[PDB]
Write a protein that holds these residues in place. Structure first.
Motif, short mmCIF file in Angstrom:
data_model
loop_
_atom_site.label_atom_id
_atom_site.label_comp_id
_atom_site.label_asym_id
_atom_site.label_seq_id
_atom_site.Cartn_x
_atom_site.Cartn_y
_atom_site.Cartn_z
N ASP C 54 0.86 -1.14 0.00
CA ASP C 54 0.00 0.00 0.00
C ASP C 54 0.92 1.22 0.00
O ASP C 54 1.11 1.90 -1.00
CB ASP C 54 -0.93 -0.03 1.20
N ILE C 55 1.55 1.47 1.13
CA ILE C 55 2.21 2.76 1.31
C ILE C 55 2.92 3.21 0.03
O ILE C 55 3.02 4.41 -0.26
CB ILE C 55 3.22 2.76 2.46
N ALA C 60 2.86 7.11 -4.26
CA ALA C 60 2.54 7.35 -5.67
C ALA C 60 1.43 8.40 -5.85
O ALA C 60 1.54 9.32 -6.68
CB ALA C 60 2.17 6.04 -6.36
N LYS C 61 0.38 8.27 -5.05
CA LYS C 61 -0.71 9.23 -5.06
C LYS C 61 -0.22 10.61 -4.59
O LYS C 61 -0.68 11.64 -5.09
CB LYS C 61 -1.87 8.74 -4.19
N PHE C 62 0.72 10.61 -3.64
CA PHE C 62 1.33 11.85 -3.13
C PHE C 62 2.00 12.65 -4.23
O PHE C 62 1.81 13.87 -4.35
CB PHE C 62 2.35 11.59 -2.02
N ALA C 63 2.77 11.94 -5.05
CA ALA C 63 3.53 12.57 -6.11
C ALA C 63 2.63 13.17 -7.16
O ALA C 63 3.03 14.13 -7.82
CB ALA C 63 4.49 11.59 -6.73
N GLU C 64 1.43 12.62 -7.31
CA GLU C 64 0.46 13.13 -8.27
C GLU C 64 -0.04 14.50 -7.82
O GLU C 64 -0.01 15.47 -8.60
CB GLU C 64 -0.72 12.17 -8.45
N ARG C 65 -0.48 14.59 -6.56
CA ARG C 65 -1.01 15.84 -6.00
C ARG C 65 0.07 16.88 -5.95
O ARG C 65 -0.19 18.06 -6.19
CB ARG C 65 -1.63 15.63 -4.59
N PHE C 66 1.28 16.44 -5.63
CA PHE C 66 2.42 17.34 -5.53
C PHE C 66 2.65 18.03 -6.86
O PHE C 66 2.89 19.24 -6.91
CB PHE C 66 3.68 16.57 -5.08
N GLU C 67 2.60 17.27 -7.95
CA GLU C 67 2.81 17.84 -9.27
C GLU C 67 1.62 18.67 -9.72
O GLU C 67 1.77 19.76 -10.25
CB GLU C 67 3.12 16.74 -10.27
N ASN C 68 0.42 18.14 -9.49
CA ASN C 68 -0.79 18.79 -9.99
C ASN C 68 -1.23 20.02 -9.18
O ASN C 68 -1.84 20.97 -9.73
CB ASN C 68 -1.93 17.77 -10.05
N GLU C 69 -0.96 20.01 -7.88
CA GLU C 69 -1.46 21.07 -7.02
C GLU C 69 -0.36 21.98 -6.43
O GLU C 69 -0.58 23.17 -6.20
CB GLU C 69 -2.29 20.49 -5.88
N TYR C 70 0.81 21.42 -6.19
CA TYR C 70 1.89 22.19 -5.60
C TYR C 70 2.77 22.86 -6.67
O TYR C 70 2.80 24.09 -6.77
CB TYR C 70 2.72 21.28 -4.68
N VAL C 71 3.48 22.04 -7.45
CA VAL C 71 4.35 22.55 -8.51
C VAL C 71 3.57 23.35 -9.57
O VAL C 71 4.00 24.42 -10.03
CB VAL C 71 5.12 21.41 -9.21
N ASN C 72 2.42 22.82 -9.95
CA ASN C 72 1.52 23.50 -10.87
C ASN C 72 0.74 24.59 -10.13
O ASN C 72 -0.09 24.30 -9.26
CB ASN C 72 0.54 22.50 -11.50
N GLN C 73 1.01 25.84 -10.48
CA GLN C 73 0.44 26.96 -9.78
C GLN C 73 -0.10 28.01 -10.72
O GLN C 73 -0.87 28.83 -10.32
CB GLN C 73 1.46 27.55 -8.79
N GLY C 74 0.30 27.94 -11.98
CA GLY C 74 -0.21 28.84 -13.01
C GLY C 74 0.80 29.94 -13.28
O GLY C 74 1.58 30.30 -12.39
N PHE C 75 0.80 30.48 -14.51
CA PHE C 75 1.79 31.50 -14.89
C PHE C 75 1.36 32.92 -14.49
O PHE C 75 2.16 33.88 -14.61
CB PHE C 75 2.13 31.45 -16.39
N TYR C 76 0.11 33.05 -14.02
CA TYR C 76 -0.35 34.36 -13.57
C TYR C 76 -0.78 34.32 -12.11
O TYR C 76 -1.52 35.19 -11.65
CB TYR C 76 -1.41 34.94 -14.53
N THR C 77 -0.28 33.31 -11.38
CA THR C 77 -0.64 33.09 -9.99
C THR C 77 0.56 33.23 -9.03
O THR C 77 1.52 32.52 -9.11
CB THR C 77 -1.30 31.74 -9.76
N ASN C 78 0.46 34.18 -8.10
CA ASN C 78 1.49 34.51 -7.19
C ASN C 78 1.15 33.98 -5.83
O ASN C 78 0.17 34.36 -5.24
CB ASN C 78 1.63 36.01 -7.13
N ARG C 79 1.99 33.10 -5.33
CA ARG C 79 1.82 32.54 -3.98
C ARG C 79 2.80 33.18 -3.01
O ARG C 79 4.03 33.14 -3.23
CB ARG C 79 2.02 31.01 -3.97
N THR C 80 2.26 33.73 -1.92
CA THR C 80 3.09 34.18 -0.79
C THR C 80 3.81 33.00 -0.17
O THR C 80 3.38 31.85 -0.33
CB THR C 80 2.26 34.88 0.29
N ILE C 81 4.92 33.26 0.50
CA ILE C 81 5.69 32.17 1.10
C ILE C 81 4.85 31.43 2.16
O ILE C 81 4.98 30.22 2.34
CB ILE C 81 7.03 32.66 1.68
N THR C 82 3.96 32.18 2.83
CA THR C 82 3.02 31.61 3.78
C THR C 82 2.08 30.61 3.09
O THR C 82 1.80 29.55 3.63
CB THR C 82 2.19 32.72 4.42
N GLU C 83 1.58 30.97 1.90
CA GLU C 83 0.68 30.10 1.13
C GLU C 83 1.40 28.85 0.66
O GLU C 83 0.82 27.75 0.67
CB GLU C 83 0.09 30.86 -0.06
#
Lengths: 193, 94, 113, 164, 113, 109
Positions: C54-55, C60-83
Motif C-alpha cells: 500500500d504505502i 505514488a498518489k502523493f507525487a500526483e497531488r504534488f505535481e498537480n497542485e503544488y508545482v503546478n500553480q499557473g503563470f499568472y498566480t502569485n503565492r506568498t511564502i506563507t501560502e
C-alpha cells in the motif's frame, strides 16, 4: 560534462595514485560525499592495508577487501535485478544486497553538517565496518542452516536500525557500537530456534 | 508410455496403489523420491501439500508434472498460491 | 522538475524571520517523499500495480497531488511564502506521521493539519 | 574505432534492435492473453478437484492391506510458439477422480510451460531495452561527437599550414 | 536496391501512350509488397515461422522471388517494357485480390493472371 | 588478456626439443576454447545461465582465467607444469570438440 576522458583529468591520473571520482547520480540521490565507489581507486590501499593491520592488530585489510567484494557483487546483482526482477535472486544473493545496502547508507554516506557524523575516528570506523560485516556473516550462517531470507530480515528490524544509527554514536561511547556485535549473534541464533 | 507416482501420508494416498501408481510415503526422503522419479521418466508426480511444503526447491527445479494434491486433513493453500503468484508476474494484476 | 533542480544558497534565505520556522524541515520532507513517490510510480510501470505495497501506493498518489497542485500553480498566480508553506503541510498530511521521519516532533505537533 | 563505417553500421543495428524490441514485446503480450484464459481454467479446475479429492479422502478414512495387493494399462502440440503436453490414460469415489486429476495435470503443466516462455521472452525484452539499445545509443553519440571534433581540428591545422 | 533508389521525373515518361496504363499502379504495388515481404522475412527470424500468418508466408515468398527473378535479370538480359510489366503481374499474382489495394479493380480485372 | 595478445616468434622457438611436442597444438586449442568460453560467459550474463555445450565452455573460461592466467607475480612455472595444466583444462571439453588437435596427440596426452 563530467567526462573524464579529457586531457586535464587524463594527464593528472597519469601521475597521481588516488582518484576520487565524483558522481552526479549520487549527488542527485543525496549520497554524500558523492564518490563513485566502483570507479574510484587508491593505489595506496595495499600499503595502507598493511599499516592498518599492523597498528590496529586486526585483519582490517581483509575486511576492507570483503566490503568492496560485496559492493562489487552488488553492482553485478543490480544488473540481474534490472533484467529479471529482485524476486528472482536467491536467498543468498538477497542477503548480499541488503549487506551492500547497509554499507552504502550506514557507512559510506556521511553528513558533513552533522556534529557527530562530520568526522569519524579511525577506531570508530573499524567498529562500524566490523558490525556491518558481522550482520552479513551471521545471517549467511543462518541461511546455510536452513533459515529463510525474510524470516531473518523480519526478526532483525531493531538491530538493523541500531546499526544504521551507529554513525551518530559519540566518540567516547564507542562501546555502544562494538556491543552491537553480540546483539547480532544473539537475535539471529534465536531466530534459527 | 509414462508412469505415475504419488507422495503423501499412508492414510491419504494408499488407494492410488490400486491403479498401479508408485505410491511412496522429511525434506530429505521426499527430495530423494522426487529425484529418482524424475530420473526414471515419470509422466506425473502427485504429492500432498504437507510433503510439498518440505521440498520447495526440489519442486521448483522441475516446474514430470509435479501436482500438489490435498491430504485427508486439507491443503495449506500452496497449489493455489503458486497459481496466484504466477499470475502476478506474468499478467501484472490479479 | 524539482528532482534535478537545486539552489545552493537557499539556507541563507529561509527559516525564522526570513521565511518561516518550518521551512527547511518541510522542504526536506516534501522532496524526499516526492522522490519516493515518483519511484513507486515508475515501479508500477515496469512491474505492474500489483508490485506495490500500500504505502508505495500512498507515495505514488502523493507525487500526483504534488505535481498537480503544488508545482503546478499557473503563470499568472502569485503565492506568498506563507501560502506555499501551508500548502506543503496539506500534502504532507496524506502521509502517516510515522513516515515524516525528516521532521522533529516539535514542528510536527505545531503545524501538521 | 570511431569511423564513419562503424557509425552507419551501428545506426543500422539500432534500427534493427528497436524493431526486435517491439516484436518481442508484442509476442510477450500475445502469450500473456492466452495465458490469462488458461490460468483461469487452471484456477477453476484446482478449486473443484481439491474439494473432490479431500472429500473422497475423508470418505475413505471413515484385511485392507490384503485386498490392496494383487490393472497396469503425452502428445506434444503448439500453443503459438510453446510446446505443450496433451494427456490421456469409496473406491468408486477415487475412480471418478482420475479423469479430472489427469486434466489438472495437463492444464497446470501447460500453464507452467506458458509461464516459463513468458519469462524467457521478458528477459530478452529487458536485455534489449535496458542494455543493448542504450549501448548502441551511447556509442553512436560518442562516435558522432569525436568525428565532429577531429574535423574541426583538421581544418584549423590546414589553415595554419596554408599560412606557412 | 529499389527501396533507396529514386527517379524524380518517372511520372512524366510512363502511362498510356508512353508505356502502358498499368505502369504506375503496378510500380506502387510491387514497391509496397516488396517492403512488406522483407518485413515478413525479418518477422520469421525474430519470432519464428510460428508467428507468420498465411498471407505473411506469401509476402515472404514474394520478396524472395522479386529479388531472384525480377531484379536479378542478368547483365546481358534485355527486357522490353511489356515483358517487365508482365513479369510484375506474375509476381503480384501470388497475392490474393484483397492485398492488391493500390490497384483499381478496373485494371486488376484486365491484367491479373 | 591473451586474446588480443600476440608473439610473432613463437613458432620457431617451440615444439619437440625446444619446449615439448604438445606446445603448438594445445596453444591453438586453448585459444579457441577460451574465445568460445569467454563468448558464452558474456551471453550468460545477458541472457541467463540456462546450450549444454556452451555451458561447458563458460566454465572453462572461468577456470582458465582463475587458475591458468592468474598465478601471482611471484609464481615461476616450468614449461612442463604450464603445458600439463593446459591439458587439465582441455579435459573439461568433449574429445569431439578438440578439433585443433590431431589423433596422435589426443591419444597420448
Amino acid at each position: 560534462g563530467g567526462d573524464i576522458s579529457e586531457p586535464v583529468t587524463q594527464n593528472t591520473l597519469r601521475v597521481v595514485k588516488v582518484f576520487w571520482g565524483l558522481d552526479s547520480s549520487l549527488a542527485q540521490k543525496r549520497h554524500f560525499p558523492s564518490i563513485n565507489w566502483i570507479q574510484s581507486y587508491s593505489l595506496y590501499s595495499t600499503e595502507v592495508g598493511r599499516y592498518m593491520d599492523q597498528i590496529l592488530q586486526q585483519d582490517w585489510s581483509d575486511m576492507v577487501t570483503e566490503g568492496m567484494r560485496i559492493l562489487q557483487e552488488e553492482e553485478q546483482l543490480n544488473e540481474i535485478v534490472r533484467l529479471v526482477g529482485i524476486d528472482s535472486l536467491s536467498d543468498n544473493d538477497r542477503l548480499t544486497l541488503e549487506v551492500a545496502k547497509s554499507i552504502r547508507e550506514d557507512y559510506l554516506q556521511q553528513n558533513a553538517f552533522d556534529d557527530v557524523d562530520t568526522f569519524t575516528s579511525r577506531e570508530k570506523q573499524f567498529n562500524m565496518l566490523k558490525v556491518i560485516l558481522t550482520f552479513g556473516k551471521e545471517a549467511r550462517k543462518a541461511l546455510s542452516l536452513g533459515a529463510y531470507f525474510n524470516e531473518i530480515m523480519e526478526g532483525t528490524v531493531a538491530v538493523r536500525e541500531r546499526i544504521s544509527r551507529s554513525k551518530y554514536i559519540p566518540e567516547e561511547e564507542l562501546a555502544k557500537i562494538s556491543s552491537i556485535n553480540e546483539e547480532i549473534k544473539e537475535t539471529i541464533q534465536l531466530i534459527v530456534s | 508410455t509414462y508412469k505415475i507416482g504419488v507422495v503423501g501420508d499412508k492414510d491419504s494416498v494408499s488407494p492410488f496403489r490400486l491403479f498401479g501408481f508408485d505410491v511412496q510415503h522429511t525434506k530429505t526422503e521426499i527430495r530423494k523420491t522426487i529425484d529418482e522419479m524424475a530420473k526414471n521418466e515419470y509422466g506425473v508426480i502427485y504429492i500432498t501439500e504437507q510433503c510439498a511444503n518440505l521440498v520447495p526447491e526440489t519442486i521448483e527445479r522441475y516446474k514430470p508434472a509435479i501436482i500438489l494434491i490435498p491430504s485427508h486433513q486439507g491443503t495449506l493453500g500452496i497449489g493455489l498460491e503458486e497459481i496466484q503468484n504466477s499470475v502476478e508476474k506474468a499478467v501484472g494484476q490479479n | 522538475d524539482v528532482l534535478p533542480s537545486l539552489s545552493r544558497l537557499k539556507d541563507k534565505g529561509t527559516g525564522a524571520g526570513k521565511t518561516r520556522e518550518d521551512h527547511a524541515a518541510t522542504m526536506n520532507q516534501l522532496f524526499a517523499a516526492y522522490a519516493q513517490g515518483k519511484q513507486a510510480k515508475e515501479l508500477a510501470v515496469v512491474l505492474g500495480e500489483s508490485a506495490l505495497s500500500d504505502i508505495d501506493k500512498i507515495y505514488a498518489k502523493f507525487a500526483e497531488r504534488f505535481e498537480n497542485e503544488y508545482v503546478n500553480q499557473g503563470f499568472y498566480t502569485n503565492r506568498t511564502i506563507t501560502e506555499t508553506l501551508d500548502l506543503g503541510w496539506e500534502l504532507l498530511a496524506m502521509l502517516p506521521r510515522t513516515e515524516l521521519k525528516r521532521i522533529k516532533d516539535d514542528l510536527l505537533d505545531k503545524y501538521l493539519p | 574505432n570511431p569511423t564513419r563505417m562503424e557509425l552507419t553500421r551501428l545506426k543500422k543495428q539500432l534500427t534493427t534492435a528497436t524493431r526486435g524490441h517491439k516484436l518481442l514485446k508484442d509476442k510477450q503480450d500475445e502469450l500473456m492473453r492466452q495465458f490469462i484464459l488458461l490460468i483461469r481454467k487452471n484456477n477453476e479446475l484446482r478449486q473443484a478437484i481439491e474439494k473432490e479429492t479431500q472429500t473422497a479422502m475423508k470418505d475413505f478414512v471413515l484385511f485392507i492391506d490384503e485386498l490392496l495387493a494383487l490393472e497396469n494399462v503425452v502428445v506434444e502440440k503448439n500453443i503459438m510458439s510453446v510446446k505443450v503436453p496433451l494427456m490421456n490414460f469409496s473406491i468408486d469415489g477415487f475412480t471418478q477422480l482420475l479423469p479430472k486429476l489427469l486434466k489438472l495435470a495437463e492444464v497446470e503443466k501447460t500453464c507452467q510451460l506458458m509461464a516459463e516462455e513468458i519469462e524467457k521472452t521478458r528477459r530478452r525484452v529487458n536485455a534489449l531495452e535496458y542494455m543493448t539499445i542504450p549501448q548502441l545509443e551511447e556509442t553512436i553519440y560518442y562516435i558522432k561527437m569525436k568525428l565532429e571534433e577531429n574535423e574541426r581540428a583538421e581544418v584549423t591545422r590546414l589553415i595554419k599550414v596554408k599560412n606557412m
